[PDB]
A paper describes a structure:
Like other members of its family, BiP consists of an N-terminal nucleotide binding domain (NBD) and a C-terminal substrate binding domain (SBD), both of which are connected by a conserved hydrophobic linker. When the burden of unfolded proteins in the ER declines, the ER-localized enzyme FICD (or HYPE) uses ATP to transfer adenosine monophosphate (AMP) onto the hydroxyl side chain of a single residue within BiP, threonine 518 (T518). The data presented above reveal that AMPylation biases BiP’s conformational equilibrium towards an ATP bound-like, domain-docked state that is predicted to weaken substrate binding.
In all structures BiP adopted a very similar domain-docked conformation in absence of density for ATP in the NBD and all reveal additional density protruding from the T518 side chain. These findings indicate that the bulky modification favored solvent exposure of loop L7,8 and prevented T518 from forming intramolecular contacts observed in structures of unmodified BiP or other Hsp70s. The substrate-binding domain of AMPylated apo BiP is found in a conformation typical of ATP-bound Hsp70/BiP and its widened substrate binding groove likely underlies the destabilizing effect of AMPylation on substrate binding. This suggests that the bulky and hydrophilic AMP moiety sterically prevents loop L7,8 from reverting to its ADP-bound position.
Numbering used by the authors: 28 to 547
Write the structure that this text describes.
């Protein structure tokens, strides 16, 4: 059938389709070309998704869920998760060492949701938007992720798709999708393109070559917990302390108060893109009293300057890894909602010595546009030809060797799909199991990198130490996801080598439990 492209964003999501030669961003049932990544459950038992969920946040905050993308594929003890909890109105609890979301679903029934199930509900809304527009069932999709998403975060996003009833044919990196929207129908030789993607939750920078429909990522770097949400948090913080200094009251108590301030901070940020002052006004803020303050552009910039300035470091890194200088960059493409902030535009322009970014790119829609194009390439119904994409892995994959040392296996910025083999043996006589720990990151010791998984090679036949010869193959697929397999290569009595792991990701059984649910 028809394959759609869905930009699943931290705060807003967007769906498009590429067919009959052209790209069409699809408007939702309220006429909006983007949909808030919000889900809500009313006291009466009704589930809301999108605009309807966001517009009742301030009256039903405990049972309104959002920012699931900053929770997805992480652990409960993650310092990033514990930071966000302070500003979210819904209960986040530990389960299987992951953060799960607890709400009342209506008729006083408590339920606990994985972050994947929340994102699945958002995907279900985007799928129904496309189904209405096209007048047929949509079972196939391309879905986006930040370029710097790790292995667990990627897989978790695919699982969300599966829970939504979608066959996710491809996971495309957000900056690559944005580059497609820019470069589609450029016919002017090889160009070096830098994409600067600062959204509602994640930050990516990617350097690409684009040449008459052939797209190739050279280098990428970013931060998966840096975006609009962090800028909003710094401003919310400033006003919670300000209110406490004026009245002696801690609004951290009342969830309505905190989320009323969120709603107003969002509007004030938007206004500060085209004016230098904005009024924060809340009727019935805390215990009936109202809130009335002004935020200047200078104060907003003051509160976030460290975060804004930190976006320049990943830019320096991709130039160093690509072996290119500033003057080699032919075009700068800004995408993501936070690139509308004037200070972000100034920093980028000053870093590239006065160079203007490209016009004709809507930063909220450009990623969905390219996602739609990649979707069409994978269907005979929609494929025009003249579209070749080569992407890379964002993180160095290595194995833990003796002393907690990171031994590199596949370096960062290697084109995918790719694979690498290594032979392992045993350390003692008749050892039945060999354990391998895979890590993601650039630091020399595994303690300072991120653990992808602990893999056990079981069923190793009895032999003296050092005799067995097990070839383990590590394959990163086109989606950027790792698969590990093992073969016995010995000169003797062999066996099937079975691999188990310690990874916390969802099994098809659990997905089937969730897919055979959510009709409630």
């Amino acid at each position: 059938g028809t394959v759609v492209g869905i930009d699943l964003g931290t705060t807003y999501s967007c769906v498009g389709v590429f067919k009959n030669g052209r790209v069409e961003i699809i408007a939702n049932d309220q006429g909006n070309r983007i949909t808030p990544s919000y889900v809500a459950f009313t006291p009466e038992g009704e589930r809301l998704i999108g605009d309807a969920a966001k517009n009742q946040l301030t009256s039903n905050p405990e049972n309104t869920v959002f920012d699931a993308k900053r929770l997805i594929g992480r652990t409960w003890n993650d310092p990033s998760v514990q930071q966000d909890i302070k500003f979210l109105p819904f209960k986040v609890v530990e389960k299987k060492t992951k953060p799960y979301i607890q709400v009342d679903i209506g008729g006083g029934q408590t339920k606990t949701f994985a972050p994947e199930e929340i994102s699945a509900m958002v995907l279900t809304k985007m799928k129904e938007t496309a189904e209405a527009y096209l007048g047929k069932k949509v079972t196939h999709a391309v879905v986006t992720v930040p370029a710097y998403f790790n292995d667990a975060q990627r897989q978790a996003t695919k699982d969300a798709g599966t829970i939504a009833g979608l066959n996710v044919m491809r996971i495309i990196n957000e900056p690559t999708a944005a580059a497609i929207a820019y470069g589609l129908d450029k016919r002017e030789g090889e160009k070096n393109i830098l994409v600067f993607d600062l959204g509602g939750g994640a930050f990516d920078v990617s350097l690409l070559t684009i040449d008459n429909g052939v797209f190739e990522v050279v280098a990428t770097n970013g931060d998966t917990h840096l975006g609009g949400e962090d800028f909003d948090q710094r401003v919310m913080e400033h006003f919670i302390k300000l209110y406490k200094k004026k009245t002696g009251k801690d609004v951290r108590k009342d969830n309505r108060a905190v989320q009323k301030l969120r709603r107003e901070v969002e509007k004030a940020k938007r206004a500060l893109s085209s004016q230098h002052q904005a009024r924060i006004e809340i009727e019935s803020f805390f215990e009936g009293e109202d809130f009335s303050e002004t935020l200047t552009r200078a104060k907003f910039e003051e509160l976030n300057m460290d975060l804004f300035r930190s976006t320049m470091k990943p830019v320096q890194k991709v130039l160093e890894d690509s072996d290119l200088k500033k003057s080699d960059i032919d075009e700068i493409v800004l995408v993501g909602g936070s690139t509308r902030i004037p200070k972000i535009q100034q920093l980028v322009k000053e870093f590239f010595n006065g160079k203007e970014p490209s016009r004709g790119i809507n930063p909220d829609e450009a990623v969905a546009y390219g996602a739609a194009v990649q979707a069409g390439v994978l269907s005979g119904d929609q494929d025009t030809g003249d579209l070749v994409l080569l992407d890379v892995c964002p993180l160095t994959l290595g194995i833990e060797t003796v002393g907690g040392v990171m031994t590199k296996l596949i370096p960062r910025n290697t084109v995918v799909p790719t694979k690498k083999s290594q032979i392992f043996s045993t350390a003692s006589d008749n050892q039945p199991t060999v354990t391998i720990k895979v890590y993601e990151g650039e630091r020399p010791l595994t303690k300072d990198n991120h653990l992808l998984g602990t893999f056990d090679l079981t069923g190793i036949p009895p032999a003296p130490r050092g005799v067995p010869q097990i070839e383990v193959t590590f394959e990163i697929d086109v989606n950027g996801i790792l698969r590990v397999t093992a073969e016995d290569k010995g000169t003797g009595n062999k066996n099937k080598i079975t691999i188990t792991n310690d990874q916390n990701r969802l099994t098809p059984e659990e997905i089937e439990r969730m897919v055979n649910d959510a009709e409630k």
